[PDB]
Coordinates of C-alpha atoms and ligand atoms in Angstrom, one line a residue:
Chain A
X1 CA -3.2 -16.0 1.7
X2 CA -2.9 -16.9 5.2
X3 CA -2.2 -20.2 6.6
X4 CA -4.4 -21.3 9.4
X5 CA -6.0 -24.9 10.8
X6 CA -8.1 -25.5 7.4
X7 CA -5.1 -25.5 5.3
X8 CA -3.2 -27.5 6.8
X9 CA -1.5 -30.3 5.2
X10 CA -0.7 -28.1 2.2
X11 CA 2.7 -28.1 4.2
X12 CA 3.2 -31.4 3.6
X13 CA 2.5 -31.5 -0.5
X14 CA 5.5 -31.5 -3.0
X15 CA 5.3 -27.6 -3.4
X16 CA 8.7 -26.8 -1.7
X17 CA 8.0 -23.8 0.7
X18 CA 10.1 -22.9 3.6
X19 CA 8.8 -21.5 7.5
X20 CA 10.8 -18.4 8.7
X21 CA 10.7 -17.9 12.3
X22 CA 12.5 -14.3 13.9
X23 CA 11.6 -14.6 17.2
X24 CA 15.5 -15.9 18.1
X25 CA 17.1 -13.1 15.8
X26 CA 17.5 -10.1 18.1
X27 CA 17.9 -11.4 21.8
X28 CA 19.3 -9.5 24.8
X29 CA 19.7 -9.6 28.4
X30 CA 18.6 -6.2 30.1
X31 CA 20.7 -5.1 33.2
X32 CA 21.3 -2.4 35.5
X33 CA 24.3 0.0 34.9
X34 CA 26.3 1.6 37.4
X35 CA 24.5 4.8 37.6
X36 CA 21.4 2.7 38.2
X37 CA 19.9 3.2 34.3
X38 CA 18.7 0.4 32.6
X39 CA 20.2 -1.3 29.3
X40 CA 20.7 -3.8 27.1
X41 CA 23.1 -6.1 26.1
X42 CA 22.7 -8.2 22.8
X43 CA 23.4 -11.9 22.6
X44 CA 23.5 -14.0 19.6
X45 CA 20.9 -15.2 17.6
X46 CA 19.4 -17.3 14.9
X47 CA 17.1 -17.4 12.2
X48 CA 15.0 -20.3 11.7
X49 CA 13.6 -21.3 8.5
X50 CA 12.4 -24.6 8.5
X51 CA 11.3 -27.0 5.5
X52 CA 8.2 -29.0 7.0
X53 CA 8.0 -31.8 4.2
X54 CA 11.8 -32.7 4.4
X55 CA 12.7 -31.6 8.2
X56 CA 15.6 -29.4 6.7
X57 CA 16.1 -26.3 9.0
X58 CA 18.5 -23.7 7.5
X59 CA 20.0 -22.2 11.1
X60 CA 21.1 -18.8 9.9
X61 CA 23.0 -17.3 13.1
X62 CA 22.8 -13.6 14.3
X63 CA 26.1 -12.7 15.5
X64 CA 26.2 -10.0 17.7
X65 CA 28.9 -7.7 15.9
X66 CA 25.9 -7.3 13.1
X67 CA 24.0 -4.6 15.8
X68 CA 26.8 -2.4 16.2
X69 CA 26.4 0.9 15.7
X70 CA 23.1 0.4 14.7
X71 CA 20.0 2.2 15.4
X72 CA 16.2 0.6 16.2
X73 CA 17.3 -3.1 16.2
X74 CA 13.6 -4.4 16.1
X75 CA 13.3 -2.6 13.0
X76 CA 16.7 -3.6 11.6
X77 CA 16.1 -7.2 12.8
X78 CA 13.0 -8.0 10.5
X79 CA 14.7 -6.4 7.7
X80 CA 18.3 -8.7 8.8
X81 CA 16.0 -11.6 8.6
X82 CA 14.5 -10.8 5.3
X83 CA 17.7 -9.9 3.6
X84 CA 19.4 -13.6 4.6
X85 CA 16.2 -15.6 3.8
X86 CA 16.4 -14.1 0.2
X87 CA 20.4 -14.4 0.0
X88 CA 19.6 -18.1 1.2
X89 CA 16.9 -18.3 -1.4
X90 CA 19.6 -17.0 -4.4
X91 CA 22.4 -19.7 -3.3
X92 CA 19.9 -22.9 -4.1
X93 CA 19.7 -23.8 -7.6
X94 CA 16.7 -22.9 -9.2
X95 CA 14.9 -26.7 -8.6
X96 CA 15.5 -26.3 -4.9
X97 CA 14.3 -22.6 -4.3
X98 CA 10.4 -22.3 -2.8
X99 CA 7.4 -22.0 -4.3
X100 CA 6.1 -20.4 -1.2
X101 CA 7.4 -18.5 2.4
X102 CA 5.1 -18.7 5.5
X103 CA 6.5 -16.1 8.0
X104 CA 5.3 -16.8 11.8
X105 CA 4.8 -13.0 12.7
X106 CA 2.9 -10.7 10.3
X107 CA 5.9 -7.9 10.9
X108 CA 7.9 -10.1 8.4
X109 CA 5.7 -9.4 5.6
X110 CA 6.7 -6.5 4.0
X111 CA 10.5 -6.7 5.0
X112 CA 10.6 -10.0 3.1
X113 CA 8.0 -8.9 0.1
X114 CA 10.6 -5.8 -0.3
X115 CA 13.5 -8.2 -0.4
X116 CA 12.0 -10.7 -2.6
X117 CA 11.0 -8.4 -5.5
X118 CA 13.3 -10.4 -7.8
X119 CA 11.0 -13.1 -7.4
X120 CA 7.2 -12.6 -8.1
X121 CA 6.5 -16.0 -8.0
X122 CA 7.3 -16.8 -4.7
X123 CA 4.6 -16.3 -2.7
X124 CA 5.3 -14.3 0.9
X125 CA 2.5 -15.4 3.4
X126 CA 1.3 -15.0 7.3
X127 CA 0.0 -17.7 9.5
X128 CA -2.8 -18.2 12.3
X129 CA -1.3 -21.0 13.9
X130 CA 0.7 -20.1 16.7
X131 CA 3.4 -22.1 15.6
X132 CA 6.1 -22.8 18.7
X133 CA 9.4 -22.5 16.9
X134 CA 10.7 -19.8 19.2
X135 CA 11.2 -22.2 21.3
X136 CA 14.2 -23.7 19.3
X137 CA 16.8 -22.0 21.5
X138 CA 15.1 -24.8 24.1
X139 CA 17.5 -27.7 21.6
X140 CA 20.8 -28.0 23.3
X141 CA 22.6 -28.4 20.3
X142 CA 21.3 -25.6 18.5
X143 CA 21.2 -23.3 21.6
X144 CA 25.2 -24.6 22.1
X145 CA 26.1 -23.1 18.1
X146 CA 24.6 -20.1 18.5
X147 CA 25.9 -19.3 21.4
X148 CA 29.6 -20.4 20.4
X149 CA 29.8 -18.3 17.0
X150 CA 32.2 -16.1 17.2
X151 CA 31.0 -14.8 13.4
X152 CA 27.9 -14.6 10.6
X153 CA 27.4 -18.7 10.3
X154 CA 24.8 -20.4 8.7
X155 CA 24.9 -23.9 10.0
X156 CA 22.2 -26.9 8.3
X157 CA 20.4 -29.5 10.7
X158 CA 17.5 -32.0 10.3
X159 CA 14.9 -31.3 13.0
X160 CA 12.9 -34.2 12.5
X161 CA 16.6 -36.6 13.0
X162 CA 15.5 -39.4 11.1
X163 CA 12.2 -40.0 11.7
X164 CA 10.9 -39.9 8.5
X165 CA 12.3 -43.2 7.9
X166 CA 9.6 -44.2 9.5
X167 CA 6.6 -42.3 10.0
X168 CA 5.5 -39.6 7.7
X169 CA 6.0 -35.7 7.7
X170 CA 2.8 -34.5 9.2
X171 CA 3.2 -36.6 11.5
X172 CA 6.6 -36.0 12.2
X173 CA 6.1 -31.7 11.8
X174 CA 3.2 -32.8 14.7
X175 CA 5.7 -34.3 17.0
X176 CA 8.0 -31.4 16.6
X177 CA 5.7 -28.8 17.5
X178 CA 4.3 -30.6 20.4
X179 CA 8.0 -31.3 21.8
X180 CA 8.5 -27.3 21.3
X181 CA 5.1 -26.5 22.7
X182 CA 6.0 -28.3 25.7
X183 CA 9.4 -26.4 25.8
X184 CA 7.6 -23.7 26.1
X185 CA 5.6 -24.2 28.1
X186 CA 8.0 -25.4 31.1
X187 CA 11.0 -26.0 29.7
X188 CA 12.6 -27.8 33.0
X189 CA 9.4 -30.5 32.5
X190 CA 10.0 -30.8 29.3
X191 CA 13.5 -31.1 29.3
X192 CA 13.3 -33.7 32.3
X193 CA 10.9 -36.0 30.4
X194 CA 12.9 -35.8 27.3
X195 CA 16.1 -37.3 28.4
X196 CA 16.7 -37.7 32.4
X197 CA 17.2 -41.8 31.9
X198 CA 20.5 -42.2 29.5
X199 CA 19.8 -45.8 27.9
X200 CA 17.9 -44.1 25.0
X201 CA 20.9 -41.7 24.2
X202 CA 20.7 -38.7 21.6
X203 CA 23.1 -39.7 18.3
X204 CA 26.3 -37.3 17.7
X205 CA 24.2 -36.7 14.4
X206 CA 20.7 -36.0 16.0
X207 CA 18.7 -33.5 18.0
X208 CA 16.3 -35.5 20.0
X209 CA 17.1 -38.9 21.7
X210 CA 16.7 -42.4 19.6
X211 CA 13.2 -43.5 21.2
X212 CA 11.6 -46.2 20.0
X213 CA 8.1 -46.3 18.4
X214 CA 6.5 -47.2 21.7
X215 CA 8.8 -45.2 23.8
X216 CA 7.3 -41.8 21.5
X217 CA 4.0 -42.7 21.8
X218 CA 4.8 -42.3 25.8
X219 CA 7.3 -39.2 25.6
X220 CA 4.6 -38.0 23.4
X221 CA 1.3 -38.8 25.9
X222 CA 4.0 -37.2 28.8
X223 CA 4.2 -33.5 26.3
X224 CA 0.1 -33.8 26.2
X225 CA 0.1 -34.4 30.2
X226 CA 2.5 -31.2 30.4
X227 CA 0.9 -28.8 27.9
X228 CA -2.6 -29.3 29.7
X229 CA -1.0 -29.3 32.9
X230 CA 0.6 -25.9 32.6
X231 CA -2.7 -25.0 31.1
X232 CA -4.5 -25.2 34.3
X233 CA -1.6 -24.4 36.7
X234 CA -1.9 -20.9 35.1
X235 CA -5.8 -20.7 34.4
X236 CA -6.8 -22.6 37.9
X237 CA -8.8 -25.6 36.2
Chain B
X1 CA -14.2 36.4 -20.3
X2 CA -14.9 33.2 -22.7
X3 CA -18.5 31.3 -23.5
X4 CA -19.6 27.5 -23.7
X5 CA -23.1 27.5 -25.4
X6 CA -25.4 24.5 -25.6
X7 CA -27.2 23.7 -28.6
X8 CA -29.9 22.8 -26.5
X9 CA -31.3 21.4 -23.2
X10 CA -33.6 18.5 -23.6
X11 CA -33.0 16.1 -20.4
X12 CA -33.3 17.4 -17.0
X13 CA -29.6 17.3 -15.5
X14 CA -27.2 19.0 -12.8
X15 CA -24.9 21.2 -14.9
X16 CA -21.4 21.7 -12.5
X17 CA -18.8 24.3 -14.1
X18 CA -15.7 24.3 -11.8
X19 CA -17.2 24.0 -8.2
X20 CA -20.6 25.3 -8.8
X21 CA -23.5 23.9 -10.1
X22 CA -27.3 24.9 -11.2
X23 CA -30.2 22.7 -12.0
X24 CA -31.5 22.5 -15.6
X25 CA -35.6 21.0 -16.5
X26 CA -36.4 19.1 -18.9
X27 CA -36.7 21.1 -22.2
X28 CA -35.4 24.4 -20.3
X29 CA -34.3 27.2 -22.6
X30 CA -31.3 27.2 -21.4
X31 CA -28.3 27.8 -23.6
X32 CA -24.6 27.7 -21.9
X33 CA -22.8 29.4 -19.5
X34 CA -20.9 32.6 -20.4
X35 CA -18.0 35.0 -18.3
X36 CA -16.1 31.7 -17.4
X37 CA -12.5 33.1 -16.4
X38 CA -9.8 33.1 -19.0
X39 CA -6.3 31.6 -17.7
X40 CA -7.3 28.4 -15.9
X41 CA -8.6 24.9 -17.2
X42 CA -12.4 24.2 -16.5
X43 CA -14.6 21.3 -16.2
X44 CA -17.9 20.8 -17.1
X45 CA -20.1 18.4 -15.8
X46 CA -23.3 16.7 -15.5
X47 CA -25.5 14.2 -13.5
X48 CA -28.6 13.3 -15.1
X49 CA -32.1 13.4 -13.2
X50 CA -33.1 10.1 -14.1
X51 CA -30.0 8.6 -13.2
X52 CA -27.0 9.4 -10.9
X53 CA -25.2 6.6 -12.3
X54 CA -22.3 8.0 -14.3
X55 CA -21.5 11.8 -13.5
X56 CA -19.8 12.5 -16.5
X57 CA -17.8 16.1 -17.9
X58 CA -15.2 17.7 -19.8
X59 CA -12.0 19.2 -18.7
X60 CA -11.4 22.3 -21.6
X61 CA -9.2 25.5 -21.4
X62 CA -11.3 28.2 -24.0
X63 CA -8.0 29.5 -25.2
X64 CA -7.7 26.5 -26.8
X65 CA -10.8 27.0 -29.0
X66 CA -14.3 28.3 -29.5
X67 CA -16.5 25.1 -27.8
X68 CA -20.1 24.2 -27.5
X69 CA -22.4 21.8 -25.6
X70 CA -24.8 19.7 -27.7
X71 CA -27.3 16.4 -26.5
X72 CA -26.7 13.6 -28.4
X73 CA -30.2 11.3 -27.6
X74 CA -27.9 8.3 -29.5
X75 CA -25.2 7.6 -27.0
X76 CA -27.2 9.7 -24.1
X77 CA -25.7 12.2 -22.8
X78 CA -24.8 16.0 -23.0
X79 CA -21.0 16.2 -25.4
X80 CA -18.5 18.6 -25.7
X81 CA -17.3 19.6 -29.6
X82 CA -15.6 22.2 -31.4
X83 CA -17.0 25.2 -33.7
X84 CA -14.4 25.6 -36.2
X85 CA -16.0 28.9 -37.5
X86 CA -15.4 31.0 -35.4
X87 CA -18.2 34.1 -37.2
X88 CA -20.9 31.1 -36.3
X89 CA -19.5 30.7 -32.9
X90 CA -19.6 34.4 -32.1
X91 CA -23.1 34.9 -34.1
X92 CA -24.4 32.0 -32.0
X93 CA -23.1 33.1 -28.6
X94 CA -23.9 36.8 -29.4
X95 CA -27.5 35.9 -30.3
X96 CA -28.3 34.1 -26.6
X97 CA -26.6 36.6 -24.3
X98 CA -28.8 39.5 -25.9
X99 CA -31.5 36.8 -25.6
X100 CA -30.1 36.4 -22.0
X101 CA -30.3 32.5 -21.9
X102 CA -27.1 31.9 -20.4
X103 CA -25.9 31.7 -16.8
X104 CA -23.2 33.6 -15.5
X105 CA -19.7 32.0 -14.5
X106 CA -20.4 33.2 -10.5
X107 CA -17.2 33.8 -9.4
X108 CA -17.1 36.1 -5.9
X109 CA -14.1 38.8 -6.4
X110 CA -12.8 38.0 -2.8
X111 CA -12.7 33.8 -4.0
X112 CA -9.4 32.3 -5.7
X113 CA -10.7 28.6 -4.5
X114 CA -10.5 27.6 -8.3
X115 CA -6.9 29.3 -8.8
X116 CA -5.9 27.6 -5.7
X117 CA -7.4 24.1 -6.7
X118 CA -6.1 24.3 -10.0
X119 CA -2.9 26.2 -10.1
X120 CA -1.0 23.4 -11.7
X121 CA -2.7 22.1 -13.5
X122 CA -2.5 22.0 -17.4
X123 CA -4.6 21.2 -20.4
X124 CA -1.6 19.9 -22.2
X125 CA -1.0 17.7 -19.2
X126 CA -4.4 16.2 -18.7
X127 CA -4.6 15.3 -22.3
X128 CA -1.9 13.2 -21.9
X129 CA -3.5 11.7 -19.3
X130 CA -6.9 10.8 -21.0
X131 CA -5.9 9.8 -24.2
X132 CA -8.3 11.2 -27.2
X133 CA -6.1 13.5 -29.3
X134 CA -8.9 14.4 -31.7
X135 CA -10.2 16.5 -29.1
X136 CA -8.4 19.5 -27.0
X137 CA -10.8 18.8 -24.8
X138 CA -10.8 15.7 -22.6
X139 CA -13.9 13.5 -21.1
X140 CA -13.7 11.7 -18.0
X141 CA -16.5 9.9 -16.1
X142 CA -16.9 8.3 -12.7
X143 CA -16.5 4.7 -14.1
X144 CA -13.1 4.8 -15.9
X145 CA -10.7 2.6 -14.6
X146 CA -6.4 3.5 -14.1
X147 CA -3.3 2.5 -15.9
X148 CA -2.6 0.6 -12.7
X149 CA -5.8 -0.9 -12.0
X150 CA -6.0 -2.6 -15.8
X151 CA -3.1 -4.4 -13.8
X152 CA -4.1 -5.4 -11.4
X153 CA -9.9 -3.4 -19.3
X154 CA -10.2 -1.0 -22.6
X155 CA -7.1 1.0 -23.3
X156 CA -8.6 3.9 -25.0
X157 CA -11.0 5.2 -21.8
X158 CA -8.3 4.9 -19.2
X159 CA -7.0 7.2 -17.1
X160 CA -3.1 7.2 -17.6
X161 CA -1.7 8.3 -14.3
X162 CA 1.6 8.0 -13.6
X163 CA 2.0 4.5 -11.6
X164 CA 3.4 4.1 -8.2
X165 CA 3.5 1.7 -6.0
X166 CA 5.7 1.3 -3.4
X167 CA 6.6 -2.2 -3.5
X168 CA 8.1 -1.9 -7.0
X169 CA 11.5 -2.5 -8.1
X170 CA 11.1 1.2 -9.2
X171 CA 10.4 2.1 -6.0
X172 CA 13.5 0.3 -4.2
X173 CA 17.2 0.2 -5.5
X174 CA 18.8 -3.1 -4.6
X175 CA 21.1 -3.4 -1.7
X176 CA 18.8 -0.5 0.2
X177 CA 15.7 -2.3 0.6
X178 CA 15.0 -1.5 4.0
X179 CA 16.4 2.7 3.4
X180 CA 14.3 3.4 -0.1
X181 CA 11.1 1.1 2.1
X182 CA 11.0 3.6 5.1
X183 CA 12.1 7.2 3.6
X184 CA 10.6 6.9 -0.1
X185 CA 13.2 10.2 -1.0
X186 CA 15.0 8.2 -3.8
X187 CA 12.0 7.1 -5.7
X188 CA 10.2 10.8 -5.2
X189 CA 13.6 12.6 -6.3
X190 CA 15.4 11.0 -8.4
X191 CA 12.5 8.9 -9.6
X192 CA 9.8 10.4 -10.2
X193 CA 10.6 14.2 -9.9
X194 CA 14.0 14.3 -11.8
X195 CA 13.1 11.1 -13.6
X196 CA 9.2 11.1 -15.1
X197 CA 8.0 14.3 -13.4
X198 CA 11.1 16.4 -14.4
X199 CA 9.8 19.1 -11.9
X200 CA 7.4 19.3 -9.1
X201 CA 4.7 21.5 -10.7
X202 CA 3.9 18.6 -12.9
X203 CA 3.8 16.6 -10.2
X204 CA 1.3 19.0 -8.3
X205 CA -0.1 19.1 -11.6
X206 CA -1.3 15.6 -11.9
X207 CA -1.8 15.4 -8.5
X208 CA -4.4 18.6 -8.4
X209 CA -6.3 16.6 -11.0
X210 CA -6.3 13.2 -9.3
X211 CA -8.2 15.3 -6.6
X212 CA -10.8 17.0 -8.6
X213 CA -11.7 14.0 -11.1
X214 CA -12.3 12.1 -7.4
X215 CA -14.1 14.8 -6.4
X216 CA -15.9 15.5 -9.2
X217 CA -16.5 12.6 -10.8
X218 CA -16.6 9.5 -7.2
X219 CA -13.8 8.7 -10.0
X220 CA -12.1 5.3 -7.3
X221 CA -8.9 4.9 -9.1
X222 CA -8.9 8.9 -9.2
X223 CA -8.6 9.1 -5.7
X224 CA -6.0 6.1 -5.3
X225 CA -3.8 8.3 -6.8
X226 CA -4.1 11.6 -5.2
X227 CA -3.8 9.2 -1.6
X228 CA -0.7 8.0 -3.2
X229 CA 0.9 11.2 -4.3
X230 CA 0.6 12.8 -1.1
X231 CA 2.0 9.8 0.8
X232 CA 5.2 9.6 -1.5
X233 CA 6.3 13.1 -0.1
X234 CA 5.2 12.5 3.5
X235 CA 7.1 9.3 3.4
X236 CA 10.1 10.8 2.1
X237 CA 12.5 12.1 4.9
X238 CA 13.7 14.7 2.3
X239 CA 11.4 16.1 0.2
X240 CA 12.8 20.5 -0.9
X241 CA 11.4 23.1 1.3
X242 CA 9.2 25.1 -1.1
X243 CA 7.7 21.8 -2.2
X244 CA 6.0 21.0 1.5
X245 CA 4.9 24.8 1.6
X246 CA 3.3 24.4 -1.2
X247 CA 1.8 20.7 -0.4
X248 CA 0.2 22.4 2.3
X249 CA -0.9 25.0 0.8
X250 CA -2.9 22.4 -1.6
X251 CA -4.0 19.8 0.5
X252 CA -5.4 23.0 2.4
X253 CA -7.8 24.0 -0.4
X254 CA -8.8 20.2 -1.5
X255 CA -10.2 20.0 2.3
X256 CA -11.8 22.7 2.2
X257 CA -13.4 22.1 -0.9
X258 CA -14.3 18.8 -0.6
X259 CA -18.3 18.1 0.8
X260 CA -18.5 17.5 4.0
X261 CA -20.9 14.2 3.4
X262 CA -18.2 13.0 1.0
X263 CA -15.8 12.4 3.4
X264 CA -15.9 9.0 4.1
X265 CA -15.6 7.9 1.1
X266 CA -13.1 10.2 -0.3
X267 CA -10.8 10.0 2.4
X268 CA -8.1 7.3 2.7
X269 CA -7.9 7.2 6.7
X270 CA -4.9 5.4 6.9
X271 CA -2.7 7.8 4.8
X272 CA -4.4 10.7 6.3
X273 CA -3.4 9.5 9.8
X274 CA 0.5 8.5 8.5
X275 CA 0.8 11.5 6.6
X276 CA -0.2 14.2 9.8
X277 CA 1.3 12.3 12.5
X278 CA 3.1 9.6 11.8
X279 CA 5.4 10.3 8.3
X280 CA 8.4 12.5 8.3
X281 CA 6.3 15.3 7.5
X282 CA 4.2 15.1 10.1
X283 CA 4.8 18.3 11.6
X284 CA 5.5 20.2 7.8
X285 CA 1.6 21.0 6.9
X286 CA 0.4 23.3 9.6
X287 CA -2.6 24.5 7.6
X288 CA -3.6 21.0 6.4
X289 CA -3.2 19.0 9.8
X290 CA -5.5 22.6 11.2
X291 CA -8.3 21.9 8.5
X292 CA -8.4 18.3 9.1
X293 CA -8.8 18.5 12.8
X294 CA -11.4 21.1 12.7
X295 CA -13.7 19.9 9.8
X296 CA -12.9 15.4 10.3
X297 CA -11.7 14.7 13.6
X298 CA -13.8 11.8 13.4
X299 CA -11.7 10.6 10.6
X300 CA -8.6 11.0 12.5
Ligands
LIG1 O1 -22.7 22.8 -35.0 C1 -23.9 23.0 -35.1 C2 -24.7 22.1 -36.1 N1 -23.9 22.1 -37.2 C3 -23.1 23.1 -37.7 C4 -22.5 22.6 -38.8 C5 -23.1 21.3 -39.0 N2 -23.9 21.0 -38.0 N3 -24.7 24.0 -34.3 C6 -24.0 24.8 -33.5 C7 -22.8 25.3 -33.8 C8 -22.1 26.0 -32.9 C9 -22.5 26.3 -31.7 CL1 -21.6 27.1 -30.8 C10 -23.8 25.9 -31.3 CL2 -24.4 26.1 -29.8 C11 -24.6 25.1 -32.2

């Protein structure tokens, strides 16, 4: 069933199972038109599904050109989302395909039960964490390939960089979601404390920037500072 | 005008014929019900004094034979059989009604409420449905269990509806997942009407007696499937014109049949809700959306 705090390092067991986040897949700007009306433009977006054990995120992007013409994009976008999570799940081989999909928004259920009929041992279910992927667009290099695609791309990344060379993968899904809590939260904050020094640069092949041990232990304690911070800056505390 | 006599009447028990009912005592000489109409199926039921547990009957059609009630005080309750001679059946039966032990069928001129409830419905249909072929008569009781739900356990007392279920491969042709999800036309169409069905007064058919075996019967499963027959044409965004008069004209008739105290149990609010104001038939059953508001606004 659902997957909340008492369950959780069942992510991080040999089971394969895959997150899929659609918060980034139908995105627009709203804007005045010339007669004073309101509407929409679409931008490009991105599915992310995200392997937790192994850090592999398969970055599905929404190019624009896919909601023309089209009616009730909301709709359309959940069913979008399900219908490329199950054409991604057909391309692995067998060995690689999950055993399980955790969708962050309980709206994804039944497009992606529908779409997944061919495969009654995959098991399709919600969360009650209030995971902070939507805050992926926050990762410069990610936001940068969405935003260049000029078609459908699926592009594949490593959120966790490296880091499970040396620490393991619930600590390293933890350090995720706090840097994308923090994002946020207050992006600008979080963005300052990630990288406004350069001598701790981020790799051509990476995401984040090559801290050391130490030096994540304080970008980490920084996050913490921020979350609570913006915690009370918007309750008063 | 056709006769069901009972050999006897030794437990005190609620006799229902169609949608009445009359209370028989212990050791009553009472001995069957005669002037049940010809032309339409019938049920027969009963609900023991000593325990409502179990409402239990018989759906029969008495052109299909000469049939009798008898107690059996081995298995425990009140059973349907045949008379095969038919001088001993109408010896019998004459003997009583000039004794005057039977109760009369009570239809009111002015009422077709068990036309209307019933008018697809078919013995050959329902016999197909509760398996027993020794029998043209068919028993059914508020415990048995669906096709469906032995899938979700003895074959021979099931109740063999026709399954749905909307997240099915049946139900959803590859490639238009999200179309056949929202507007459920292919799998009521070409599905299940040209398909299984092959017409829509089958389909009525079966769903009429979903109704009445919940109705009559608490019968769960029963229900399920009445709640999911009238949800596959008010999901469909193309469902033919004479079939949604005639939808409303049944749903109309079930409401008003159905006790007012049973409503909260035999009423699925969530379809109820989808189906009148939400669905794409939401404005397509004018008598059944009037009945509903006036009798179970709570509901909705
Ligand atoms: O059938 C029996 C008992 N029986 C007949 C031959 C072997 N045993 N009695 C009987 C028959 C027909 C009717 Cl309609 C009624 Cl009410 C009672």
């Amino acid at each position: 069933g659902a997957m909340n705090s008492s369950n959780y390092a069942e992510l991080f067991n040999n089971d394969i199972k895959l997150f899929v986040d659609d918060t980034n897949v139908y995105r627009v700007t709203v804007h005045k038109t010339f007669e004073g009306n309101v509407a929409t433009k679409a931008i490009n977006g991105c599915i992310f599904t995200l392997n937790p054990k192994t850090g592999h995120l398969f970055l599905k992007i929404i190019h624009t050109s896919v909601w023309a013409g089209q009616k009730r994009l909301s709709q359309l976008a959940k069913w979008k989302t399900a219908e490329e999570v199950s054409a991604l799940v057909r391309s692995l081989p067998k060995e690689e395909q999950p055993k399980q999909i955790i969708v962050t928004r309980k709206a994804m259920l039944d497009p992606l039960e529908v779409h997944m009929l061919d495969f009654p041992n995959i098991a399709i279910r919600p969360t009650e964490l209030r995971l902070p992927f939507s805050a992926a667009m926050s990762i410069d290099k990610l936001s940068d390939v969405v935003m260049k695609a000029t078609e459908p791309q699926m592009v594949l990344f490593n959120i966790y960089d490296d880091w499970l060379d040396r620490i393991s993968s619930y600590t390293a899904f933890s350090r995720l979601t706090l840097l994308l809590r923090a994002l946020k939260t207050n992006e600008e904050s979080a963005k300052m404390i990630l990288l406004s020094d350069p001598t701790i640069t981020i790799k051509s092949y990476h995401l984040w920037p090559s801290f050391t041990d130490e030096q994540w232990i304080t970008i980490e304690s920084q996050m913490r500072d921020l979350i609570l911070t913006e915690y009370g800056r918007k309750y008063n505390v | 005008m056709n006769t069901v006599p009972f050999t006897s009447a030794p437990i005190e028990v609620t006799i229902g014929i169609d949608q009445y009912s009359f209370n028989v005592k212990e050791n009553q000489p009472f001995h069957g019900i005669k002037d049940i109409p010809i032309g339409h199926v019938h049920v027969i039921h009963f609900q023991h004094a000593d325990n409502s547990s179990m409402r239990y009957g018989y759906w029969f059609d008495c052109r299909m034979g000469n049939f009798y009630i008898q107690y059996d005080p081995k298995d425990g309750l009140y059973k349907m059989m045949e008379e095969r001679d038919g001088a001993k059946f109408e010896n019998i039966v004459h003997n009583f009604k000039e004794r005057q032990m039977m109760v009369s069928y009570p239809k009111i001129d002015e009422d077709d409420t068990w036309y209307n409830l019933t008018e697809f419905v078919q013995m050959d249909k329902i016999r197909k449905i509760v398996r027993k072929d020794e029998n043209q008569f068919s028993y059914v009781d508020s415990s048995m269990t669906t096709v469906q739900e032995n899938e979700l356990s003895d074959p021979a007392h099931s109740l063999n509806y026709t399954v749905i279920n909307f997240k099915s491969r049946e139900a959803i042709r590859p490639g238009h997942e999200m179309e056949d999800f929202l507007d459920k036309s292919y799998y009521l169409n070409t599905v299940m009407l040209q398909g299984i069905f092959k017409n829509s007064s089958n389909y009525f058919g079966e769903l009429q007696f979903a109704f009445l075996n919940a109705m009559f019967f608490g019968n769960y499963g029963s229900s399920l499937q009445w709640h999911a027959m009238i949800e596959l044409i008010c999901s469909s965004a193309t469902v033919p014109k004479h079939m949604l008069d005639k939808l409303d004209e049944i749903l109309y008739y079930q409401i008003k049949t159905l006790p007012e105290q049973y409503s909260d149990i035999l009423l699925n609010e969530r379809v109820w809700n989808i189906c009148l104001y939400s669905s794409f038939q939401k404005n397509s059953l004018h008598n059944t959306e009037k009945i509903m508001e006036n009798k179970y606004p709570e509901l909705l």
